[PDB]
Amino acid sequence: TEFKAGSAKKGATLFKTRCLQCHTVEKGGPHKVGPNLHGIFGRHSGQAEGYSYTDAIIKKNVLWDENNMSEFLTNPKKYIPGTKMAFGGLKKEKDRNDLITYLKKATE
Amino acid sequence: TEFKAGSAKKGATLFKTRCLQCHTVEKGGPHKVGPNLHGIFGRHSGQAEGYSYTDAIIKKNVLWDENNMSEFLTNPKKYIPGTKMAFGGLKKEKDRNDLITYLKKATE
Ligand code: HEC
Ligand code: HEC
C-alpha cells in the first residue's frame, strides 16, 4: 500500500513504551484514558461503546486501515484537529511500520 | 469517511446487473472471469489463491476499504492501469454507495 510490514516484536515494545499508558489492545480489556483498541481495523473512528470521544474524532469518521493508522500516528492533532489524544507522534516510518504490524496482529 | 451507507437492496441488484457476470461474493463460491470476492475488505489486491491476477493489481497492492473500493469502481483502469478488469465504471456516487453497502455486507 504505502505501509510495509515491519517487526511485530519491535512493534509490541513500542506499544508498551508509547501507547500502553492510555490504551489496552486485548479483547475484553478496558478503556483507560484512551479506548480499548480491540478490533479497530476496519472500524470507523469514535464507535467503541462506553467511551466518551471528542466531537472531532466522531466527525472525522475515519475508516481505520493500516494506511490511515499511519498518517494518524505521524501527527494525531494535525490529522484530527480537536482530538483529545495527547501524543506528539512517531515521525519515523520504520517505527510506525513496526507498531501497525503489531497492532494489526494483537487487535484481531 | 467519504463513502456514506446506501441501500443494500439497491446494491444487491446493481451487483447482479453489473458485476455478477464476472464475480461471485459467497464464501466457498468460485472464481470466474474475475475472482470470488468473499472477504475482500481489509485484504490487499491480488491475493485470492488459485486466481491468475495481472502483474499490475498485485503491484498496486491496494488495501481494500469501502473508500478505496469507491475510487476503484469509479474507473478501474484509471485507478489500476494495466488491470484486466473490463468494466467502464459507476460514475454516480449514489450507485457506488448502494453497491459497496451490499458488498460490505455480502462478502463478510
Ligand atoms: C494518552 C496520553 C494517549 C496515548 C499515549 C496514546 N493515545 Fe491513542 N487515544 C487517546 C485518547 C484520549 C483517545 C480518544 C480521543 C478522542 O478524541 O476521543 C485516543 C484515540 C485513539 C485512536 C482512535 C480510537 C477510535 O476508537 O477511533 C487510536 C487508533 C489510537 N488512540 C491509538 C493509539 C496508539 C497506537 C498509540 C501509541 C503510538 C496511542 N494511541 C497513544 C489517548 C492516548
Ligand atoms: C468482467 C467483464 C468483470 C466485471 C463486469 C467486473 N469485474 Fe471485477 N475483476 C475482473 C477481473 C478479470 C479481475 C482481476 C483483474 C486483474 O487485473 O487480475 C477483477 C478484479 C476485481 C477486484 C480486485 C480483486 C482482488 O482480489 O483484489 C474487485 C474489488 C472487483 N473486481 C470488483 C468488481 C465489482 C464490484 C464489479 C461490479 C461493479 C466488477 N468487479 C465488475 C472482471 C470483472
- Going by C-alpha positions, the residue among B69, B63, B75, B81 that lies closest to residue B105 is B69
Using an 8 Å Cβ cutoff, are A77 and A83 in contact?
yes
Please state, in angstroms and rounded to a whole number, the distance separating the CA atoms of residues A68 and B90.
Answer: 25
- Going by C-alpha positions, the residue among B96, B26, B84, B91 that lies closest to residue B60 is B84
Contacts of B108 in chain A (CB under 8 A): none
Using an 8 Å Cβ cutoff, are B100 and B11 in contact?
yes
Question: Which of A44, A61, A67 has its CB closest to that of B63?
Answer: A67
User: In testing the pocket of ligand 2, which one of B38, B60, B87, B99 has its CB within 8 Å of the most ligand atoms?
Assistant: B87
C-alpha grid cell, residue B53: 491476477
Total count of residues recorded for chain B: 108
Total count of residues recorded for chain A: 108
Using an 8 Å Cβ cutoff, are A40 and A19 in contact?
no
What single letter denotes the amino acid at residue A23? H
DSSP state of B7: -
Residues 6+ apart with CB under 8 A from B86: none
A6-to-A100, B88, B99, B105 alpha-carbon distances in Å: 8, 37, 34, 31
Please state, in angstroms and rounded to a whole number, the distance separating the CA atoms of residues A95 and B59.
Answer: 24
Nearest chain A residue (CA) to B42 = A42
Contacts of A62 in chain B (CB under 8 A): 1
Half-sphere exposure for A40 (CA within 13 Å, toward CB): 25
Question: Domains along chain A?
Answer: 1-108 (1.10.760.10)
DSSP state of A22: T
DSSP B43-81: SBTT--TT----HHHHHH--B--TTHHHHHHH-HHHHST
Half-sphere exposure for B100 (CA within 13 Å, toward CB): 24
Q: Does B41 touch chain A (CB under 8 A)?
A: yes
- Going by C-alpha positions, the residue among B1, B8, B20 that lies closest to residue B71 is B1
What single letter denotes the amino acid at residue B31? H
For residue B24, give how far its alpha carbon lies from the nearest alpha carbon of chain A (Å). Answer: 22
- Going by C-alpha positions, the residue among A100, A108, A106 that lies closest to residue A6 is A100
- Going by C-alpha positions, the residue among B50, B14, B44, B54 that lies closest to residue A5 is B44
Experimental method: X-ray
Contacts of A1 in chain B (CB under 8 A): 44, 61-63
Residues 6+ apart with CB under 8 A from A81: A56
Q: Does residue B108 sit in helix, strand or coil?
A: coil
Please state, in angstroms and rounded to a whole number, the distance separating the CA atoms of residues A29 and B22.
Answer: 43
DSSP state of B30: P
Report how far Cα B39 is from the mean position of its chain's Cα atoms: 11
Nearest chain A residue (CA) to B64 = A65
Query: Cβ B41–A44 below 8 Å, yes or no?
Result: no
